[PDB]
């Protein structure tokens, strides 16, 4: 086991996308993903008047079982395989690390969320590091946390919490359209507040980026398009936006808690090259009362221990460099666990058992089809 | 344990839309005709001198119904053979022995089905497509068409009274009767039973986006004299507009008429309006270019929903661009099926097996005469 002191200090572009459909199946064709799997922002000021009910339709929420909603490296590799075959001249993508934005967000946000655990699996294959959350650990963590909530909250509060979760998806539904306005039917526009809401559908952008000298492929869910998707398909990232919801702010204490969320939102968007985020603010009856659009670049200054985004990024840089330094890049006989333990506040890198390596390399992280592809090159 | 889709099939989103592009001006390059005896006429002088009608216009549109000379519908399917016969003659005699300079060769009616699709989601489409001599040839499928009309007819017997079934046949006759009573066989100065054998077919060069296309289409009459397209006119009939429901019925027809005329560069359309007793009560002249605004300004309604001609055209542009992108132009070893399935609302492109390819290339679509000609160039 190796240990990285917490005191350690060191232009994104989308290259492909994929989606999960309403039935939980994955969609890989680039054209169809762009044509019918990403929505467009539409929320006129006239409707931010307190009439929009973000808990309406809760009972028919189509919710994916959490066991099928963990970060999945397999679909990422399936999409990557297609990209390499069809758009990278049959060559492997030129990065050092392949992972999900949400996992990197956990690393970036760590210095100011020392109460949150982190557990990541890392393994070297074909000269690249593949990083994902651990299925077993994650599933158990989610189960434990929900069971704890059910047990420690009144029935009313627990149901209220579930409705808050729902309201985020509901906000996305009532603040977006499936196509540009000019290509929508009147029914598609006028009847969005009644449309069934689901969390099966996801649009996943995969970007090439990096930090310091590290090159990274990062996959992340994107909520919508702010204006349009460039016809020539260039610099599409700058056209995306995130959509969040939170409670109205009625006191100083609530504002400080909002800054903590803002930090996490900055981390998510910054890593992904997303330049805009809209927050919807709702009351305890779930009515939409205010909306605010933030530029990602200004969030650090809207935030006023003491959160420092620069320090966070220097820490993140140090973690990434450390992994690249400490994990033998061409040794495929081992797998590693990167862990942050909140009870001792230690950030650790350890070698997993051979059988854990076997599990990861033969299904959980790497797929047979991806390995066969990379072998064939 | 069954694939979600065939590995030999690709899907186009119904939401796909091309950017609006410059209007293309169609131009006639040759014509051919089918005579009263059902024989084809290819000589340009003879076709123009003997096979063209001229507009000239109580009147009972079901009169003479008893003698309607109706060609057997299985002898009236769109025929690539006659088109290729006419095209060969054109290439030999007027194009300096070179192939016509287009990407796609097909019939107007088939393209109309694609253009009108967004507002006709219950109507199936099935087209055969194949690459030959650097060009795509597109026709309906003979067997599918045969089965489909019979299927629909059985469905009618099964759902209609003998009288209403009879009423539907008289409605069909009334259109041909209107043409007969509203035209002369020659210009007035030379004029000293109803049938659907006689057809005058204009073949035009046109385009959409970057695609160049040859389209063959029946033309009803000349409005003044033989830029020949600008001298043609379409003739249609429909029931008088005595209720909102009839306005609904008319709008669907008027949109299809716009699509047909727009694609062919026909600039004028006359509708005859008839009552229950099939008396002609009103006649209205339209310019094709004014139809989209008439439809837009109609409060009554029916991308599904309100018909929008611009949206239709953007869909059509997307379809044509997609076909040209997805079907290898220089591979003559394969044939394709383009299909819209109303039950699933999916638009797909599927590679046919070798024996279907052979059937199309060796008689049904390509003729031996046409292939020998193109080879000799």
């Amino acid at each position: 086991m190796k240990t990285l002191s917490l005191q350690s200090r060191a232009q994104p572009k989308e290259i492909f996308a994929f989606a999960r459909d309403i039935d939980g199946e994955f969609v890989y064709d680039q054209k169809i993903v762009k044509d019918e799997n990403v929505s467009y922002y539409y929320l006129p000021d006239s409707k931010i008047d307190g009439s929009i009910d973000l808990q309406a339709g809760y009972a028919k929420f189509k919710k994916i079982p959490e066991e099928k909603n963990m970060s999945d490296m397999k679909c990422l590799l399936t999409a990557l395989t297609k990209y390499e075959q069809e758009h990278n001249n049959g060559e492997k993508v030129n990065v050092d690390i392949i992972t999900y934005r949400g996992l990197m967000t956990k690393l970036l946000a760590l210095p100011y969320n020392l109460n949150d655990p982190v557990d990541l699996n890392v393994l070297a294959y074909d000269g690249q590091l593949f990083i994902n959350s651990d299925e077993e650990i994650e599933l158990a963590r989610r189960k434990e946390e929900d069971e704890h909530k059910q047990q420690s909250m009144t029935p009313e509060k627990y149901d209220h919490m579930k409705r808050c979760e729902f309201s985020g998806y509901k906000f996305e539904a009532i603040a977006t359209l499936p196509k540009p306005w000019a290509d929508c039917s009147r029914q598609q526009i006028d009847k969005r507040g009644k449309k069934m809401v689901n969390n099966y559908e996801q649009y996943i952008s995969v970007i090439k980026t990096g930090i310091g000298e590290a090159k990274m492929l990062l996959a992340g869910e994107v909520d919508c398009v702010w204006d349009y998707i460039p016809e020539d398909g260039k610099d599409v990232l700058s056209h995306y936006m995130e959509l969040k919801t939170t409670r109205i702010l009625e006191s100083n204490g609530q504002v400080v808690n909002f800054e903590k969320k803002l930090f996490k939102t900055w981390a998510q968007c910054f890593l992904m090259g997303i330049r805009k985020v809209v927050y919807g603010f709702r009351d305890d009856s779930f009515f939409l009362r205010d909306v605010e659009l933030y530029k990602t670049e200004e969030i650090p200054l809207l935030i006023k221990g003491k959160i420092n985004c620069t320090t966070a990024l220097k820490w993140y840089g140090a973690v990434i460099e450390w992994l690249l330094q400490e994990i033998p890049r061409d040794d495929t006989s081992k797998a590693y666990r990167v862990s942050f333990d909140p009870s001792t506040r230690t950030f650790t890198l350890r070698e997993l058992m051979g059988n854990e390596n076997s599990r990861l390399r033969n299904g959980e992280m790497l797929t047979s089809e991806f390995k066969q592809w990379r072998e064939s090159i």
Side-chain angles (χ1 to χ4, degrees), chain A:
Chain A
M1 178 172 299
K2 301 177 182 166
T3 296
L4 181 65
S5 170
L6 295 185
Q7 291 174 301
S8 299
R9 302 284 182 269
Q11 173 58 51
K13 74 166 49 179
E14 178 182 290
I15 51 158
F16 60 93
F18 64 103
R20 188 170 70 192
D21 73 14
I22 193 155
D23 297 316
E25 303 291 340
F26 291 98
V27 183
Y28 296 106
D29 180 79
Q30 296 307 283
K31 189 180 180 65
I32 209 158
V33 166
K34 293 280 191 295
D35 280 351
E36 70 181 26
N37 294 90
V38 65
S39 54
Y40 295 80
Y41 187 77
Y42 178 77
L43 188 53
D45 290 13
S46 60
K47 291 306 168 295
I48 320 173
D49 67 341
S51 63
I52 300 177
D53 189 340
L54 298 175
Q55 73 173 332
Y58 174 69
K60 62 186 182 180
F61 184 25
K62 190 186 198 250
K63 197 180 185 294
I64 188 167
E66 286 281 88
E67 322 86 59
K68 304 175 182 57
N69 202 34
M70 289 178 290
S71 266
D72 182 6
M73 179 65 58
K74 308 181 303 298
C75 52
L76 176 51
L77 296 181
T78 299
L80 178 55
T81 296
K82 186 170 176 63
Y83 168 77
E84 292 177 347
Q85 290 168 337
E86 304 179 0
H87 296 290
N88 206 34
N89 258 83
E91 304 294 347
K92 79 185 176 182
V93 62
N94 183 36
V95 297
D96 300 303
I97 297 169
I98 292 160
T99 193
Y100 275 98
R101 175 271 309 275
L103 306 175
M104 300 300 100
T105 294
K106 290 181 178 304
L107 296 178
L108 179 55
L110 185 154
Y112 306 108
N113 291 273
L114 297 167
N115 288 331
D116 297 343
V118 180
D119 292 283
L120 304 175
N121 295 329
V122 184
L123 65 87
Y125 177 77
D126 202 12
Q128 299 171 324
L129 298 184
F130 297 78
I131 304 182
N132 201 14
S133 54
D134 182 79
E135 284 187 357
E136 289 174 288
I137 291 177
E138 282 314 311
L139 193 49
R141 187 153 293 155
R142 292 184 189 188
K143 178 181 195 168
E144 176 181 65
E145 287 183 24
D146 179 68
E147 293 175 351
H148 173 256
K149 287 177 173 174
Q150 293 186 231
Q151 281 289 319
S152 67
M153 302 179 66
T154 62
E156 305 103 299
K157 292 289 192 164
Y158 181 81
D159 178 77
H160 186 78
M161 181 190 61
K162 301 250 81 178
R163 291 173 178 265
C164 284
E165 178 178 52
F166 171 78
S167 71
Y169 296 100
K170 177 74 170 184
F171 179 60
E172 295 165 352
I174 65 80
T176 63
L177 295 173
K179 291 171 292 184
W181 184 99
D183 300 296
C184 288
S185 66
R186 178 41 177 156
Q187 290 72 22
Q188 283 177 310
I189 300 163
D190 203 39
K191 321 304 298 182
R192 293 141 71 209
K194 269 69 186 296
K195 190 188 185 86
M196 180 182 69
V197 177
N198 79 84
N199 72 346
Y200 277 78
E201 292 170 322
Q202 301 178 327
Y203 177 80
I204 306 301
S205 173
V206 188
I207 62 165
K208 195 168 184 299
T209 183
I211 183 160
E213 299 184 21
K215 296 176 285 261
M216 305 180 72
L217 190 73
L218 204 50
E221 178 167 7
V222 165
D223 291 335
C224 72
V225 166
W226 153 256
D227 50 2
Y228 63 94
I229 302 169
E231 188 71 6
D232 59 15
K234 314 277 284 302
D235 187 22
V236 68
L237 266 186
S238 68
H239 292 276
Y240 292 153
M241 86 191 322
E242 291 296 272
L243 299 177
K244 308 285 190 186
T245 76
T246 195
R247 189 184 184 282
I248 299 157
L249 306 170
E250 301 181 290
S251 69
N252 298 324
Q254 286 163 17
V255 177
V256 306
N257 288 331
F258 182 57
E259 293 186 358
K260 294 174 183 176
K261 293 182 181 193
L262 277 183
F263 174 59
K264 287 176 185 175
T265 294
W266 166 84
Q268 295 158 13
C269 295
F270 181 77
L271 289 166
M272 204 63 192
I274 300 184
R275 308 188 180 192
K276 295 179 170 57
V277 58
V278 167
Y279 266 86
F281 298 81
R282 50 154 203 280
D283 62 28
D284 296 322
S285 295
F286 295 92
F287 289 108
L288 186 60
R289 298 287 181 185
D290 290 280
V291 170
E292 192 70 15
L293 167 54
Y294 298 117
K295 301 193 311 168
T296 302
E297 59 196 312
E298 62 183 359
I299 295 174
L301 291 70
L302 278 167
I303 304 178
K304 276 293 178 294
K306 195 166 179 307
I307 301 170
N308 185 319
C309 292
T310 290
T311 306
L313 208 51
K314 289 174 187 181
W315 155 255
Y316 176 64
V319 172
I320 300 304
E321 166 68 333
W322 189 57
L323 298 180
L324 288 171
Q325 290 168 306
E326 293 301 333
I327 302 178
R329 303 283 301 278
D330 299 281
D331 177 1
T332 57
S333 71
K334 300 189 184 308
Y336 293 88
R337 167 70 45 74
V338 172
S339 180
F340 176 72
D341 172 24
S343 71
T344 59
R345 292 183 175 183
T346 61
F347 194 94
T348 280
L349 172 68
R350 73 175 179 89
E351 181 177 348
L352 290 169
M353 309 172 345
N355 277 321
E356 286 171 310
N357 179 63
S358 186
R359 174 174 164 138
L360 293 176
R361 288 180 184 273
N362 296 283
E364 176 176 341
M365 181 99 46
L366 307 179
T367 64
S368 178
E369 292 71 28
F370 175 70
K371 294 188 300 182
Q372 291 162 2
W373 161 241
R374 288 297 190 79
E375 287 166 10
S376 75
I377 303 185

Short mmCIF file of all heavy atoms in Angstrom, two decimals, chain A residues 71 232 248 370 375:
data_model
loop_
_atom_site.label_atom_id
_atom_site.label_comp_id
_atom_site.label_asym_id
_atom_site.label_seq_id
_atom_site.Cartn_x
_atom_site.Cartn_y
_atom_site.Cartn_z
N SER A 71 -21.99 3.60 -12.72
CA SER A 71 -21.07 3.94 -13.79
C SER A 71 -20.56 2.67 -14.44
O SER A 71 -19.98 1.79 -13.79
CB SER A 71 -19.91 4.80 -13.29
OG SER A 71 -20.18 6.18 -13.46
N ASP A 232 -21.46 21.68 -38.82
CA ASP A 232 -20.20 21.06 -39.19
C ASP A 232 -19.68 20.17 -38.07
O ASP A 232 -18.70 19.44 -38.24
CB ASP A 232 -19.15 22.12 -39.56
CG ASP A 232 -18.87 23.10 -38.42
OD1 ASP A 232 -19.26 22.81 -37.27
OD2 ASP A 232 -18.25 24.15 -38.69
N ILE A 248 -35.06 27.17 -2.59
CA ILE A 248 -34.92 28.61 -2.52
C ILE A 248 -34.06 29.00 -1.33
O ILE A 248 -34.01 28.28 -0.33
CB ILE A 248 -36.30 29.28 -2.40
CG1 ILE A 248 -37.15 28.95 -3.62
CG2 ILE A 248 -36.15 30.79 -2.26
CD1 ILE A 248 -38.61 29.08 -3.38
N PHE A 370 -13.71 -5.46 -26.38
CA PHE A 370 -12.76 -4.36 -26.40
C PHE A 370 -11.36 -4.92 -26.48
O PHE A 370 -10.53 -4.44 -27.25
CB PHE A 370 -12.93 -3.48 -25.15
CG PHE A 370 -11.90 -2.38 -25.02
CD1 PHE A 370 -11.92 -1.29 -25.89
CD2 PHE A 370 -10.94 -2.43 -24.02
CE1 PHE A 370 -10.99 -0.28 -25.77
CE2 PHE A 370 -10.01 -1.41 -23.89
CZ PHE A 370 -10.03 -0.33 -24.77
N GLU A 375 -6.40 -6.00 -29.38
CA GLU A 375 -5.45 -7.04 -29.79
C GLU A 375 -5.27 -7.09 -31.30
O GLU A 375 -4.19 -7.44 -31.79
CB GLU A 375 -5.92 -8.41 -29.32
CG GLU A 375 -5.79 -8.65 -27.84
CD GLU A 375 -6.57 -9.87 -27.39
OE1 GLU A 375 -7.06 -10.63 -28.26
OE2 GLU A 375 -6.70 -10.08 -26.17
#
